[PDB]
Structure formats: structure tokens, C-alpha cells
């Protein structure tokens, strides 16, 4: 192939918009790429799995980081019944004043969203107590992502 | 009275310039020199791309990071006391 997608000259020789779409849509179907072998198949799948793991670890570290940085985790562990868990802060320049006022829940000093993923109950149950713990866990999972 | 010519495939397939005029520059000579000297730096497409992206991002970041509270309600923040949640939750 001389152009995108490089893994398929059949699609690459398409003069139409299709060429792009299908290029995106067959990117992970390794078995049907040009000049592939069992070896390349398994190896690409392996690397792809590592990539997926990295994305998971990065995602979790993002959650931990945002709860620690913009949430009310400590206020929650002090009173889990009467505190709405903050997922993350929100900065939307499209907001008007009523929107800013309305979305300021919890003990936040600005607009926030309330977490419904239940990460608070989980982390609190397993032993996390402070923002610092969350930060260290975030750094560790970031390290796992890089690894 | 025909419209097919192998020697002239241009006229055969209507490859004409319908409104393009061969007229010379009707523009102001002094202004022409002005623009040809002052607008020159932006005539290199790679350099122009880099300048527009980096410069545009830089400008956006500037006006964003320094946006007054009288312009953006998001920077002004809440000014009224917070309301309690549905089940007595903060």
C-alpha cells in the first residue's frame, strides 16, 4: 500500500471516501491485513493486550487523581451517609451563572459532578482514608501504565 | 460542427476556464509592494502551519488563563450559599 490504510492496498487503491472509513473499521482485524502470518498475528495481539492494560491503569489513575484533587473523599469518610461523592470538578465556559450555582454541590467551591461509580465506598472499604493515599495509588497505577 | 478531437482533448471534454481573465494586475503598485514584502513570512505553508497552530494555541491559552470574572461566569464562581441535597446530603 502506498497510502492509508497501509495494511490493505485493496482499500488503499479506493478513489472514494470509503477508503477512509473502512481503513478505520478494519484496523484491528489483523487476520485480514496484507502479508500477515500467525506470528505477526499473535505478536500484535500480545502488544495490543499490553496497550489495553496500559489504558486501564491510566484510566484508574485518572479516577484516583481526580477524586483526590477535586473531590470530597475525606469529608465523605467522615460522614458517608450525608455527603455526595464528588467525581471531578467542571470548567465549562459555556455555563451561565445559574448553571454555576446549581452544579456547586457537596462542599465544593465550584461546579462539580457527583460520582455514581461508587469508587468512594470501594476505596474506603479496602483501606483508603486520605487524599494522599489516593495520590500515591494514582502514581503507582501510572507507573504500571508506563510499565 | 463536431466536438471530438484526439489532438485537442481539452476542448473535447470541456476543460475550459469559464471566468478566468488574462488581465494584468489591477492592484495598487505601492500596496502591492507593501503586501509582497510584509505578507511574505506567511507564504511558506509549513512555517505558516506551525505559526498558526503554536501561535493560535498560545493566544487561546493566554485569553483563557486570564479571563475576567465579568466575562465568564465559570471563573466568577458561585456567589449564593449552597443548597442541601435531597436526603440531607451536603
Amino acid at each position: 500500500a502506498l497510502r492509508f490504510p497501509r495494511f490493505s492496498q485493496g482499500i488503499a487503491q479506493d478513489p472514494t471516501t470509503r477508503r477512509i472509513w473502512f481503513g478505520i473499521a478494519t484496523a484491528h482485524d489483523f487476520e485480514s491485513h496484507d502479508d500477515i502470518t500467525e506470528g505477526r498475528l499473535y505478536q500484535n495481539i500480545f502488544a495490543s493486550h499490553f496497550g489495553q492494560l496500559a489504558i486501564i491503569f491510566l484510566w484508574t489513575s485518572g479516577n484516583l487523581f481526580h477524586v483526590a484533587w477535586q473531590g470530597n473523599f475525606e469529608a465523605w469518610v467522615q460522614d458517608p451517609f450525608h455527603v455526595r461523592p464528588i467525581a471531578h470538578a467542571i470548567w465549562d465556559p459555556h455555563f451561565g451563572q445559574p448553571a454555576v450555582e446549581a452544579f456547586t454541590r457537596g462542599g465544593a467551591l465550584g461546579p462539580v459532578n457527583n460520582a455514581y461509580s461508587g469508587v468512594y465506598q470501594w476505596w474506603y472499604t479496602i483501606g483508603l482514608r486520605t487524599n494522599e493515599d489516593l495520590y500515591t495509588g494514582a502514581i503507582f497505577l501510572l507507573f504500571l501504565s508506563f510499565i | 460542427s463536431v466536438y471530438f478531437d484526439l489532438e485537442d482533448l481539452g476542448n473535447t471534454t470541456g476543460q475550459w476556464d469559464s471566468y478566468g481573465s488574462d488581465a494584468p494586475s489591477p492592484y495598487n503598485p505601492l500596496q502591492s509592494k507593501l503586501f509582497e514584502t510584509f505578507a511574505a513570512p506567511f507564504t511558506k505553508r509549513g512555517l505558516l502551519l506551525k505559526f498558526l497552530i503554536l501561535g493560535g494555541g498560545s493566544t487561546l491559552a493566554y485569553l483563557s488563563a486570564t479571563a475576567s470574572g465579568d466575562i465568564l461566569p465559570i471563573t466568577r464562581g458561585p456567589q449564593q450559599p449552597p443548597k442541601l441535597g435531597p436526603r440531607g446530603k451536603i
Binding site: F4, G23, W91, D92 | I53, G57, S64
Partner: peptide
């Protein structure tokens, strides 16, 4: 609120512009 005013327009406007331009040029080549 300080950092979000920097990172939000960065990821919401600059990043997708850079990425879309890059991908455009890549796919058109």
C-alpha cells in the same frame, strides 16, 4: 480552577485541531 482554564481549552480545542489536521494530512498522503 486555575489549571482547568488552561487544560480544558487545550484538550477541547487545540488538541483536536492538531490531531484532526495531522490525521487529515496522513490520510490524504
Amino acid at each position: 480552577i486555575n489549571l482547568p482554564s488552561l487544560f480544558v481549552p487545550l484538550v477541547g480545542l487545540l488538541f483536536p485541531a492538531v490531531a484532526m489536521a495531522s490525521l487529515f494530512l496522513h490520510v490524504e498522503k
